[PDB]
Amino acid sequence: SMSVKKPKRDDSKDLALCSMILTEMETHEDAWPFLLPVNLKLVPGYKKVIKKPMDFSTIREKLSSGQYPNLETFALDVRLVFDNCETFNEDDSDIGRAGHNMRKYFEKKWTDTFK
């Protein structure tokens, strides 16, 4: 509360560490469904159904331009990528499996780096 603060957790490396995680996600062999924004002209249903599209290139641009106020808003966009993927894709499809694999990969790096 006013003039009463929990001890300062060092966040000075967060930007660098989120960038490293994001590089690892970008280079994973199963990243291909997520590298670029879904083409809303060419994929029927996507625009109407997926209210907030997100992809790794968009996260990379936001990261690079100071549009994440803290590491939690970064994790929210990464999870959005996988949540969108599950909304639109069957679990037993190549893309559906890719999205599960990637979410697992991310959540381990996240825990190991920050928790």
The CATH code of the domain that includes 81 is 1.20.920.10
Query: Which 3 state secondary structure label does DSSP give 36?
Result: coil
Closest C-alpha among 100, 87, 92 to residue 28:
100
CA dihedral (1, 70, 84, 52) positive or negative = positive
Q: How was this structure determined?
A: X-ray
CA dihedral (64, 69, 71, 73) positive or negative = negative
Residue 60: both structure tokens together: 């990379």
| DSSP H helical ranges for the chain | 14-27, 46-49, 56-64, 71-88, 94-114
For 37, 71, 82, 99, the CA distances from 50, given in Å and listed in that order, are 12, 24, 12, 15
Number of domains in the chain: 1
Burial class (CB within 10 angstroms; exposed 0-12, middle 13-18, buried 19+) of 4: exposed
Q: Domain limits at 95?
A: 1-115
Residue 24: both structure tokens together: 């690892």
Contacts of 34 (CB under 8 A, 6+ apart): 25, 55, 56, 81, 85, 98, 99, 102
Contacts of 20 (CB under 8 A, 6+ apart): none
Burial class (CB within 10 angstroms; exposed 0-12, middle 13-18, buried 19+) of 27: exposed
